[PDB]
């Protein structure tokens, strides 16, 4: 029982840690993915502005 419970604690610490570190990498990547997608939406808007100058001449 002393071994079982010491292993249980090592087990669940390892699983809790891996679940957090993965969940964090999902979040931080989804945060940076949104930030770049807003910046790429500006490049698409600046392509419409530069077309509406040429298509008004």
């Amino acid at each position: 029982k002393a071994i079982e419970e010491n292993n249980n604690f090592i087990k669940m610490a390892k699983e809790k840690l891996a679940q957090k570190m993965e969940s964090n990498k999902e979040n931080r990547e989804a945060h940076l993915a949104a930030m770049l997608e807003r910046l790429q939406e500006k490049d698409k808007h600046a392509e419409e502005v530069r077309k509406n100058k040429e298509l008004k001449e």
Binding site: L32, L36, L39, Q40, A46, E48, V49, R50, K53, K56
Partner: protein, 421 residues
């Protein structure tokens, strides 16, 4: 985190940049060629933040000098520290902008932007550990206002995890009487709220009022205004340019100063324009604010104070406690211990003791409302839109810029009205 990459854009940006580099080169013991001639080891300890070490012990600025108008290239190169700059880092266009934001941001500045990005990448790649970027510019012009904000958004794409800082010069009718400046500022603010980590509101109205009323000059030139800005910029970069026991970089300080991402517009201040209690009362006074807003019309979210000179630190601790006690209502109760202080041994040239002030006050809305009033005076009668709508823009984008700045003011007000219980 050590190396910062400086970028100066437009006439305003390049001249305040030039002055910035004159003062810190003097402080660090760098002569116009770029050799070390000082005495203290503290001058070289964090020299790498703003300078590259070339062959023959040559210290060269990490500066990128940018404009659509040539001629500004000559004035910087002819100036006192014109030789020290890197020749390839000069990236100058052809036909200028003529105080037009859509020229700087969407069309003519967009053609020059990739040639600037080359110099940024070349400087950034050589950095052992790049911390971030500082942009000196005005928001009333065309190039620094528009191409400066395009650079911000383009630098963000390739360096999303680096700090982006701006010394953004706010336009005022008392200094410059160009009529479309309220359009330029409002379009820039729409970019700055989204894409910068912290922005210093160096306001030309406050700099005029200081120069007129305090310094006694009847009609001040741009040279007089810049004496104050170079004193400010030297002050707010002291924490990065010298140690001592403080261990701070652009991110640490942005973390302690910016409690909400959009609310990153600070109120600078300097003193004197002397004893420690006088300094401390002077820097918190509205007359010494480089932004034209009254602290007492709102509340401080956070404050950073930075003293310079030989002085009793016990006395500085007592005096900073004194003003927080005496002015308790003007600091939000729901962020404990939000006023922080550093002391630097090395004073600036001329003064034995100085203090520099950085404040994230909800009163900054007084600056944004003033611009918003000047903006809406023109926009509601569709005046001067042919400058912008000709270059390709839509009225929708003009409405969005107004609405974003009105939201910014609404949010500053929300947290000013917020209470603990």
């Amino acid at each position: 985190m050590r190396e910062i990459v400086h970028i100066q854009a437009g006439q305003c940006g390049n001249q305040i940049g030039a002055k910035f580099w004159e003062v810190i080169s003097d402080e660090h013991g760098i002569d116009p060629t770029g050799s070390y001639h000082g005495d203290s080891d503290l001058q070289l300890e964090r020299i790498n933040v703003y300078y590259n070490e070339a062959t023959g012990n040559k210290y060269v600025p990490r500066a990128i000098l940018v404009d659509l108008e040539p001629g500004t290239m000559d004035s910087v190169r002819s100036g006192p520290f014109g030789q020290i700059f890197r020749p390839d880092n000069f990236v100058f266009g052809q036909s200028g902008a003529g105080n037009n934001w859509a020229k700087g941001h969407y069309t003519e500045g967009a053609e020059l932007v990739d040639s600037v990005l080359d110099v940024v990448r070349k400087e950034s790649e050589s950095c052992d550990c790049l911390q971030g970027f500082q942009l000196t510019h005005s928001l009333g012009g065309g190039t620094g206002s528009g191409m400066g904000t395009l650079l911000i958004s383009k630098i963000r794409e390739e360096y999303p995890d680096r700090i982006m800082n701006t010394f953004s010069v706010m336009p005022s009718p008392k200094v410059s009487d160009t009529v479309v400046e309220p359009y330029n500022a409002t379009l820039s603010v729409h970019q700055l709220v989204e894409n910068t980590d912290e922005t210093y509101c160096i306001d030309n109205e406050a700099l005029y009022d200081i120069c007129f009323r305090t310094l006694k000059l009847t009609t001040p030139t741009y040279g007089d205004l810049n004496h104050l800005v170079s004193a400010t910029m030297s002050g707010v970069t002291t924490c990065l340019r010298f140690p001592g026991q403080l261990n701070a970089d652009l991110r640490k300080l942005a973390v302690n100063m910016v409690p909400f991402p959009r609310l990153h517009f600070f109120m600078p201040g300097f003193a004197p324009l002397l004893t420690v209690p006088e300094l401390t009362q002077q820097m918190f006074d509205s007359k010494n604010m480089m932004a034209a807003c009254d602290p007492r019309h709102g509340r401080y979210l956070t404050v950073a104070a930075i003293f310079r000179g030989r002085m009793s630190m016990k006395e500085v601790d007592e005096q900073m406690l004194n003003v927080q006690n005496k002015n308790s209502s003007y600091f939000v109760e729901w962020i404990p211990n939000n006023v922080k202080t550093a002391v630097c041994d090395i004073p600036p040239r001329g003064l034995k003791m100085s203090a520099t002030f950085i404040g994230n006050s909800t009163a900054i809305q007084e600056l944004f409302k003033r611009i918003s009033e000047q903006f809406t005076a023109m926009f509601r009668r569709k005046a001067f839109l042919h400058w912008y709508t000709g270059e390709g823009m839509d009225e929708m984008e003009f409405t969005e810029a107004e609405s974003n700045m009105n939201d910014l003011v609404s949010e500053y007000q929300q947290y000013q009205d917020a209470t603990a219980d």
